[PDB]
Amino acid sequence: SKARVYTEVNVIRDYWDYESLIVQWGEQDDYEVVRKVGRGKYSEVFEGINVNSKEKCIIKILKPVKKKKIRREIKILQNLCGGPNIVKLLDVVRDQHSKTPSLIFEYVNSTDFKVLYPTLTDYDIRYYIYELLKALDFCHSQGIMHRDVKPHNVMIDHELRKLRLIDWGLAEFYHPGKEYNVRVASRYFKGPELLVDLQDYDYSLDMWSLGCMFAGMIFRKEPFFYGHDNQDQLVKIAKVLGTDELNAYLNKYQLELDPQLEALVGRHSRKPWSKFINADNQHLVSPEAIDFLDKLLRYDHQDRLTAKEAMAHAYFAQVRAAETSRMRSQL
Numbered sequence: 001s002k003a004r005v006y007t008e009v010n011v012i013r014d015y016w017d018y019e020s021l022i023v024q025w026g027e028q029d030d031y032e033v034v035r036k037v038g039r040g041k042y043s044e045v046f047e048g049i050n051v052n053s054k055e056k057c058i059i060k061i062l063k064p065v066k067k068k069k070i071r072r073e074i075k076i077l078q079n080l081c082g083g084p085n086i087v088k089l090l091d092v093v094r095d096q097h098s099k100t101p102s103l104i105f106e107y108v109n110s111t112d113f114k115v116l117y118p119t120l121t122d123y124d125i126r127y128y129i130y131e132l133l134k135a136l137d138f139c140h141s142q143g144i145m146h147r148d149v150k151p152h153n154v155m156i157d158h159e160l161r162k163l164r165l166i167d168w169g170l171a172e173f174y175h176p177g178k179e180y181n182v183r184v185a186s187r188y189f190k191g192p193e194l195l196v197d198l199q200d201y202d203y204s205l206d207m208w209s210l211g212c213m214f215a216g217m218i219f220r221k222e223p224f225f226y227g228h229d230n231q232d233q234l235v236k237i238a239k240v241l242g243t244d245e246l247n248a249y250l251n252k253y254q255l256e257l258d259p260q261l262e263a264l265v266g267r268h269s270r271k272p273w274s275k276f277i278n279a280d281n282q283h284l285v286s287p288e289a290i291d292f293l294d295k296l297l298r299y300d301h302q303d304r305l306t307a308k309e310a311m312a313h314a315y316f317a318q319v320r321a322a323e324t325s326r327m328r329s330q331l
């Protein structure tokens with residue numbers, strides 16, 4: 001198993017050697033903590049202030065534990081800095097005596113997806129998914145897998161029509177043929193590759209997670225695939241994509257389910273995507289939307305659209321045409 005795109009990025013390049021990175025710490029006294037805004041598995045997140053500049057920022061304090069993960073996240077953020085719709089890392093700092101490091105980010109005045117997504121229109125979804133594809137195409141082109149794509153990690157300032165892809169703490173450089181930990185991403189957004197222990201996965205894992213978000217958006221069904229645990233997650237996928245396509249995916253990739261998991265999966269016909277249409281989401285669903293979704297949510301990661309191919313899909317024609325018209329008028 002090898003990717004259809006970008007296999008040669010970390011093989012024709014200190015670029016991906018994050019373990020040997022030496023961090024250029026800034027002055028911790030430059031940023032002050034004002035309010036806790038959330039928690040992560042290894043971190044706490046605060047709103048802060050740049051005392052010199054007086055501008056708002058986000059302060060992520062990472063438990064001094066897990067130093068190689070800290071440097072992986074810093075390395076990846078620095079390599080992506082300036083890329084389209086990637087959260088900006090402003091600084092890296094730490095106490096001096098306590099050692100504990102803090103990642104300083106731009107502040108996005110976001111609306112939490114749980115309240116925002118039910119208010120999204122057809123146009124909004126095409127717009128914001130296109131903005132997110134810009135970030136994934138970019139990071140994939142730099143040879144980086146995000147591996148935690150989900151609405152929680154997509155900050156949308158809806159008033160500014162502004163989107164940022166955040167939390168690169170699980171991101172990793174792609175090396176063709178390398179085997180990767182399959183304990184990444186969040187349950188509802190895990191791709192089949194992870195749920196059946198296919199370890200030589202690639203950027204297309206992010207495109208499965210995107211397809212999960214997109215299906216949740218257009219069908220107003222979050223999460224779309226609602227497993228009660230990691231085994232039930234594959235069951236819930238199988239109840240949609242069908243077991244025929246699964247057992248052919250498994251066949252193609254030399255994989256065999258734990259007899260106990262195989263039993264849980266059972267046998268299921270592929271359901272048509274039209275089954276998820278109802279009166280309350282019909283305005284978000286079009287033939288193009290369904291076709292795009294169908295091209296993302298496929299067992300075979302090799303058969304999914306790449307981020308670049310996705311941006312070329314008909315569903316985004318009006319978004320591309322709007323950018324083209326604006327650029328023409330502004331010139």
Ligand SMILES: Cc1ccc(-c2csc3ncnc(SCCC(=O)O)c23)cc1
Nearest residue numbers: 037038039045058106107108166167168
């Ligand atoms: C658990 C949590 C809490 C707060 C926020 C957040 C709200 S607005 C906002 N604007 C920019 N960044 C963040 S998080 C720092 C970036 C990262 O972890 O990659 C946030 C994001 C996640």
Ligand SMILES: [Cl-]
Nearest residue numbers: 032033061102
């Ligand atoms: Cl602090």
